[PDB]
Amino acid sequence: SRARVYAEVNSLRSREYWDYEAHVPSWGNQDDYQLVRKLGRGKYSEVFEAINITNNERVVVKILKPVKKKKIKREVKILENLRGGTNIIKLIDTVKDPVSKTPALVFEYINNTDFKQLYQILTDFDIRFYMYELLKALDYCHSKGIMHRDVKPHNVMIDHQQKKLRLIDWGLAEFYHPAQEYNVRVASRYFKGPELLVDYQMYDYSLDMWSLGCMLASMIFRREPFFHGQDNYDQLVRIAKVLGTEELYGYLKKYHIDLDPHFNDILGQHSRKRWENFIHSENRHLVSPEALDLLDKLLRYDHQQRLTAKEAMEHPYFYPVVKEQ
């Protein structure tokens, strides 16, 4: 219904801060960048490793499919507002081809290790450390009035040699305003919070905390993704088989949420499972009472009862990380 933290923060700032449709970027010259290799492609972008020929810096250039002017302004304005944020990918420049005017965003380079390889070799401390660092990015963006809305392993770049983490891909991110109805077609299937799956539009920063919880679960249990739905309906079934169906119905009742009747054929009845049920010999060294307590406080149906990024960062699970830092 309303965020527990940072709820009014955008209303307390100048309208210019959040009125991205009115934002006028300064578009530099893309000819300063030499594209070296394609790193990947999205629905509305392609990403390249590049060199800034004026200073020989290695960077990443994200070329935007320019038919989305408002969405471009949104991502640019969000990145500008987040500049300097802890563990948020640094926007170095906003550029256009000086002839075609196709826009592109220039980011700091991170030599990331692919999450499928990485998650197989993480230690207990590593998970604590990387989760803490990711939480710093989420607390920062939430404090800046912004929901990421696409938290997932692919958007969390980790250089495991230098121990650097960056939260990337702000193209689905949005400004939080109390009582605003948001599009539920955000996030990757496996990371969608139950609010999205039940078409509850008055969500908030806590959506990102569900997604973070899914990442935590996948890391400590070594099941990636943790909730592996085959479609958006089955995704909720996978969640309910862990969190329970009675607990789902209590959430829906609290918020007066209408459940699409296609769920009637597929949800079944499921008891809440104990998190200890996911422990076995291959993951036992990554699981502790602290880890399970934290996870249990993240992967809750009720978005208002999930820990905030700060509350999570504050949990005993991270004490070993704080003591080292």
Ligand X SMILES: O=C(O)c1ccc(Nc2nc(-c3ccc4ccccc4c3)cs2)cc1O
287 assigned to a ligand binding site: no
Q: Using the minimum distance from each CB to ligand X, give the nearer residue, 82 or 219.
A: 82
The b/e string for 285-298 (b: 16+ C-beta within 10 A; e otherwise) is ebbeeebbebbebb
Number of residues binding to ligand X, judged by CB under 6 A? 14
Give the contact letters, 103-132, x = binds to ligand X (CB under 6 A), - = no.
----x--x-x--------------------
94 vs 112, which CB is nearer to ligand X? 112
46 labeled binding residue:
yes
Give per-residue burial for 213-236: e unless 16+ CB within 10 Å, then b.
Answer: bbbbbbbbbbebbbbebeeeeebb
Does residue 40 belong to the site contacting ligand X (CB under 6 A)?
Answer: yes
By CB under 6 A, residue 150 contacts ligand X: no
DSSP 213-270: HHHHHHHHHT-SSSS--SSHHHHHHHHHHHH-HHHHHHHHHHHTPPPPGGGGGT----
C-alpha 49/C-alpha 116 separation (Å) is: 21
**Does 128 count as an annotated binding residue?**
no
Nearer Cβ to ligand X (139/169): 169
Q: Annotated catalytic, 93?
A: no
Q: Does 65 show up as a binding residue in the annotation?
A: no
Specify whether the CB–CB gap between 236 and 297 falls below 8 A: no
Question: Segment 160-179, which members bind ligand X (CB under 6 A)?
Answer: 168-170
Cα three-residue angle 178-181-186, rounded to 5 degrees: 115
Is 164 annotated as a binding-site member? no
Contact 27, 98 (CB under 8 A): no
Instruction: Pick out residues in 230-259 that bind ligand X (CB under 6 A).
Output: none
Stretch that binds ligand X, among 25-33, 36-44, 176-184, 248-256 (CB under 6 A): 36-44
Out of 17, 59, 62, 219, name the contact with ligand X by CB under 6 A: 62
**One-letter amino acid of 188:** S
* Active site (catalytic) residues: 150
Q: Which residues are annotated as a binding site?
A: 39-47, 62
Residues that bind ligand X (CB under 6 A): 39-41, 47, 60, 62, 89, 107, 110, 112, 157, 168-170
